[PDB]
Design a protein around this motif. Structure first.
Motif, PDB file in Angstrom:
ATOM      1  N   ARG A  97       0.909  -0.979  -0.125  1.00 62.62           N
ATOM      2  CA  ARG A  97      -0.039   0.093  -0.014  1.00 62.62           C
ATOM      3  C   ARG A  97       1.022   1.373   0.027  1.00 62.62           C
ATOM      4  NH1 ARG A  97      -0.622   0.136   4.941  1.00 62.62           N
ATOM      5  NH2 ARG A  97      -2.503   1.795   4.982  1.00 62.62           N
ATOM      6  N   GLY A  99      -0.372   4.864  -0.989  1.00 57.82           N
ATOM      7  CA  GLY A  99      -1.258   5.973  -0.599  1.00 57.82           C
ATOM      8  C   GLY A  99      -2.495   5.999  -0.936  1.00 57.82           C
ATOM      9  N   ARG A 100      -2.986   7.307  -0.725  1.00 59.53           N
ATOM     10  CA  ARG A 100      -4.297   7.715  -1.371  1.00 59.53           C
ATOM     11  C   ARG A 100      -4.100   8.845  -2.326  1.00 59.53           C
ATOM     12  NH1 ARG A 100      -4.496   8.745   4.282  1.00 59.53           N
ATOM     13  NH2 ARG A 100      -5.919  10.423   3.662  1.00 59.53           N
ATOM     14  N   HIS A 110      -7.735   4.617  -3.190  1.00 56.72           N
ATOM     15  CA  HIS A 110      -6.269   3.606  -2.510  1.00 56.72           C
ATOM     16  C   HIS A 110      -5.473   3.071  -3.676  1.00 56.72           C
ATOM     17  CE1 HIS A 110      -8.417   3.864   1.362  1.00 56.72           C
ATOM     18  NE2 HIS A 110      -9.426   2.930   0.818  1.00 56.72           N
ATOM     19  N   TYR A 112      -2.362   0.625  -4.863  1.00 58.15           N
ATOM     20  CA  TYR A 112      -1.813  -0.459  -4.442  1.00 58.15           C
ATOM     21  C   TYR A 112      -0.582  -0.912  -5.354  1.00 58.15           C
ATOM     22  CZ  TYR A 112      -5.895  -0.873  -1.765  1.00 58.15           C
ATOM     23  OH  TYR A 112      -6.853  -0.644  -0.691  1.00 58.15           O
TER      24      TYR A 112
HETATM   25 HG   LIG Z   1      -4.684   2.900   1.092  1.00 58.88          HG
END
Ligand SMILES: [Hg+2]
Length: 148
Positions: A97, A99-100, A110, A112
């Motif tokens: 992960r 970030g946003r 989100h 990935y």
């Molecule tokens: Hg996230």
């Protein structure tokens, strides 16, 4: 098409859009002292913003397909996911992960890193279920994912 932005925040074509408030990217924010590629194991930290690290300066985290990660970048970047370059896909097994990020649709996703090494986005919030992979990169330029 989603615009690109220069290191001062000025948009390079099209019209400027603001980033989503709950994104990990926060603008305005300086960047581009040096282009610094890093590995997925050597992703930047919190506290690195001011000092940098052994690898060099740090403005946050950028990414393009490859995957190629940067901790600082000087050239043109996206502040929002160019969703025209994205296509629906089943959810992968996530390695990382990162970030946003805001989408070119204006919504929060989100982001990935899959096992196969693809960059995937999933809508963060609301009654939205989109799972998209970054398939093309037309202008070979990364998204500013997070700001330090
Ligand atoms: Hg996230």
């Amino acid at each position: 098409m989603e615009p690109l932005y220069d290191k001062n925040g000025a948009v390079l074509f099209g019209e400027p859009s603001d980033t989503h408030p709950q994104s990990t990217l926060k603008l305005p924010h300086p960047r581009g002292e040096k282009e610094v590629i890093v590995g997925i194991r050597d992703l930047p930290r919190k506290g690195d913003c001011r000092t940098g690290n052994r690898l060099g300066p740090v403005s946050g985290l950028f990414v393009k397909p490859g995957p190629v990660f940067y901790q600082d970048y000087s050239g043109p970047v996206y502040h929002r996911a160019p969703l025209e370059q994205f296509k629906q896909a089943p959810m992968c097994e996530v390695t990382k992960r990162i970030g946003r990020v805001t989408g070119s649709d204006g919504n929060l996703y989100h982001m990935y890193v899959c096992t196969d090494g693809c960059i995937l986005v999933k809508t963060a919030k609301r009654e939205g279920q989109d799972v998209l992979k970054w398939v093309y990169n037309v202008l070979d330029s990364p998204i500013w994912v997070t700001s330090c």
